[PDB]
């Protein structure tokens, strides 16, 4: 693709995190702790999953960022609207106002409803997210493989700002502690 040059600077809201989730100094890290992180409840932080926010909000243009997932067994990844559910159970959908891929038990899917199965062939290191507003794109990039297209979210009605989303997923197996990683532009 030749979007990199949309490249935006993301930073990660400790506000929005779980509170089990440990942010790095730069804001551009986190991963998941084995204990409660000692941060006061608020209406904003995701109770139920390791999920947290950017801080950007998005209303127009384009936006590019990657992430880094290496030797993650489990995550999330892609935008949401800023005025999505924090509290409770909820599906990833666009219903719900998100645009994610993940990966669960070795294979990759596009939350969409119901999910939709991704064919990658080179298990990604890093993930290209793509934004295109006005055009109501949501795209997904595999770095490690040169950049090859893995899915597109297309005619989306985001219904409001939209901010980056994280999910460093749970670590039940002991194989999933390693962190969400945005990369240097
Ligand atoms: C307690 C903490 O545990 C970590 C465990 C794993 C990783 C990691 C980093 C890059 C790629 C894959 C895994 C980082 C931290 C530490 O040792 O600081």
Redesign the pocket.
């Known amino acids: 693709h030749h979007h990199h040059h949309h490249m935006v600077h993301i930073t990660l809201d400790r506000n929005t995190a779980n509170s089990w989730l440990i942010i790095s100094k730069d804001r551009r890290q986190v991963?998941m702790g084995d204990t409660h992180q000692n941060v006061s409840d608020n209406k904003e932080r995701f109770s139920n999953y390791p999920m947290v926010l950017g801080a950007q909000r998005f209303s127009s243009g384009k936006m590019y960022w990657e992430v880094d997932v290496?030797?993650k067994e489990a995550w999330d990844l892609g935008v949401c609207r800023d005025s999505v559910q924090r509290k409770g159970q909820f599906s990833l959908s666009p219903e719900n106002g998100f645009w994610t891929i993940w990966l669960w038990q070795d294979s990759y899917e596009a939350g969409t409803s119901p999910q939709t199965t991704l064919h990658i062939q080179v298990p990604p290191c890093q993930i290209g997210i793509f934004v295109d507003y006005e055009a109501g794109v949501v795209s997904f990039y595999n770095i490690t493989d040169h950049g090859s297209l893995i899915y597109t979210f297309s005619e989306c009605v985001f219904a409001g700002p939209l901010r980056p989303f994280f999910n460093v997923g749970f670590n039940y197996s002991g194989g999933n502690?390693?962190?969400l990683?945005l990369c240097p532009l």
């Open positions: 991963r290496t030797q502690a390693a962190p990683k």
